[PDB]
Each structure stands twice: as C-alpha cells, then as structure tokens.
Design a binder for this molecule. Structure first.
Ligand SMILES: Cc1nc2c(cc(C)n2Cc2cnn(C)c2)c(-c2ccc(Cl)cc2)c1[C@H](OC(C)(C)C)C(=O)O
Ligand SMILES: Cc1nc2c(cc(C)n2Cc2cnn(C)c2)c(-c2ccc(Cl)cc2)c1[C@H](OC(C)(C)C)C(=O)O
Lengths: 132, 132
C-alpha cells in the first residue's frame, strides 16, 4: 500500500487502554498504554507518530475516535488526512510474566513483533526510503 | 557514524524532565516528557526506542544515568551495549505558546526538527536502509 497510510486502534487489556498504530504497508507497529481512551491521548499520540514517520493518512476501525476537535487539530497541524491487534496481544501474553507492568510487556511485544522475520522494522525503512 | 549509535540525555524545562534521544549519524530525535528522572523511566524509554529502531549502542553525557540495574536489564534484554538539546529547546520556545502542555510543545518541536531540511527524518531512514 501507500507508504503514508497508518491504522490506529485502541484495544483493552487488564482494564487499561493500549493504543496500537500499524503501518499498513509494512506491518510495523508502534503501541503505547494510555490511562483513558480520550481524544486528548489520541491527539498527543498522533503528534508523536507524525514527528517520527511521514504520516499522510490515518485509518481506524472506530471512526468515532477521530471526531473530537482536539484530534482534528492534531491532524490539521501535522497535515494528516483520513486483525493485527490479536497478534500483538498474543505476544503480550507470552512475555507478560517477564514484566510487572503491562506497559513494559507491550513494548517488549512491539520489539518482538517489529524484529521477527524481512522484518516489519526492516520493511518500513525500505518502503519509506524507496519513496524518498 | 555507525547506524546503531544513539545519544540519550535528560534535560529540564518548566520543572519537568525531557528525555531526548538522538540518532548520532542522522540528527534524528525522539523525545518524551517524563515525570521524574528515574532509572525506571530510562529503562522503559530504552525498550521503546529499541523496538522502533535498531539500537546497538547508547551514549550519554551523564554516565550515572546507566548505572541502575533496571536500566542494565533493559539494555540486556534488547541487546544494547554502551549541543543538540539547545536546538530542540530553541524550537520548543518558539512553539510553546501554541500549546498548553509542555509535552505537546515537545512533540511539535520533534516534528519540526525531524522534518526540516535532506531532513533528519529522511537521513535516518536512508542510513538504516542502506545498512540493510
Ligand atoms: C517495575 C520494574 N522493576 C525492575 C526491572 C528490573 C529490575 C532490577 N527492577 C527492580 C526490581 C524488581 N524486583 N527486584 C528484586 C528488584 C523492570 C524491567 C526492566 C527491563 C525489562 Cl526488559 C523487564 C523488566 C521493571 C519493569 O518496569 C520498568 C521497565 C522499570 C518501567 C517491569 O514492568 O517489570
Ligand atoms: C490540552 C489541549 N486541548 C485542546 C487542544 C485542541 C483543542 C480544540 N483543545 C480543547 C480546547 C482548548 N481551548 N478550548 C476553547 C477548547 C490541544 C492541541 C491539539 C493539537 C495541537 Cl498541534 C496543539 C494543541 C491541547 C494540547 O494538549 C493535547 C495534545 C490534547 C494532550 C495542548 O497541550 O495544548
């Protein structure tokens, strides 16, 4: 797919919210644990994603996530326009005992996912570099 | 420089801690606001960085940052071994009025820095892809 398309979804585990961003063309994931599934957390996360990768268009399985003016302001400032969460949840379960906090197990699970094989981490850099 | 070298430093502003990671070869920055300059925040940040980029060796201007066993465990698990903060502080000042929270202004400042021109964001992907 196009190199600037990202998928953004909020999932739940242990009573906390896990925001999962997926680079559609590569399978590359960035994920964070947020306290609440609010528009302010989504806006701030989008600003972070956009500063690290060339984010052009964002998709979601729950359109209502993108309705807050807060989110829309983040998309506006960064120039952003408008399946996988089980694989990551699978990895999280496997490594969960290796960490006290869920946020730590998530980052461990993002590490494993992006580096297993090319790997998602290798694909995204190639796709983005090729487009450059 | 080598494509796996990162610089990690904790800086202060408005009574909060800003952790700044710099990809030495490219000038690419990832930065986060943390509540306290603790070893647990450093360990968790290193796990995040390592899952997104091929981090091989990490440097710092304050060696004592890397002494906690917590940090060393993060480096161990991820396979990690062992100037710019004023430019980012300059950008933060410029955009500070555009946001209520410092954490928002930081991400805005990371966005500006990584995308201004090649740009740091374009260089890092090329360096990492070339090494692949
Ligand atoms: C809460 C915690 N405390 C820790 C570690 C390691 C150590 C020595 N301590 C202190 C300790 C625990 N027991 N004793 C007898 C001493 C870790 C950890 C660091 C790196 C990885 Cl790869 C996995 C876990 C985490 C981890 O949280 C962080 C990443 C710090 C936010 C977690 O969520 O478990
Ligand atoms: C605290 C806040 N509230 C906001 C926005 C936008 C809006 C409509 N609201 C609600 C509002 C403010 N006033 N009124 C009359 C309504 C933002 C913002 C979003 C994107 C960008 Cl690029 C810059 C700021 C931030 C921002 O914080 C976040 C990113 C949400 C954690 C900040 O730190 O300022």
């Amino acid at each position: 797919c196009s190199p600037g398309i990202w998928q953004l979804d909020c999932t739940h585990l242990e009573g906390k919210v896990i925001l999962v961003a997926v680079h559609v063309a590569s399978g590359y994931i960035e994920a964070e644990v947020i306290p609440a599934e609010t528009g302010q957390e989504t806006a701030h996360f989008l600003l972070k994603l956009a500063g690290r990768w060339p984010v052009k268009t964002v998709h979601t399985d729950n359109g209502s996530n993108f309705t807050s003016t807060t989110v829309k302001t983040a998309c506006w400032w960064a120039g952003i326009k408008q399946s996988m969460n089980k694989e990551l949840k699978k990895i999280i379960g496997q490594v969960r005992d290796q960490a006290e906090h869920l946020k730590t197990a998530v980052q461990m699970a993002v590490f494993i996912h992006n580096h297993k094989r090319y790997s998602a981490g290798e694909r995204i850099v190639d796709i983005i570099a090729t487009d450059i």
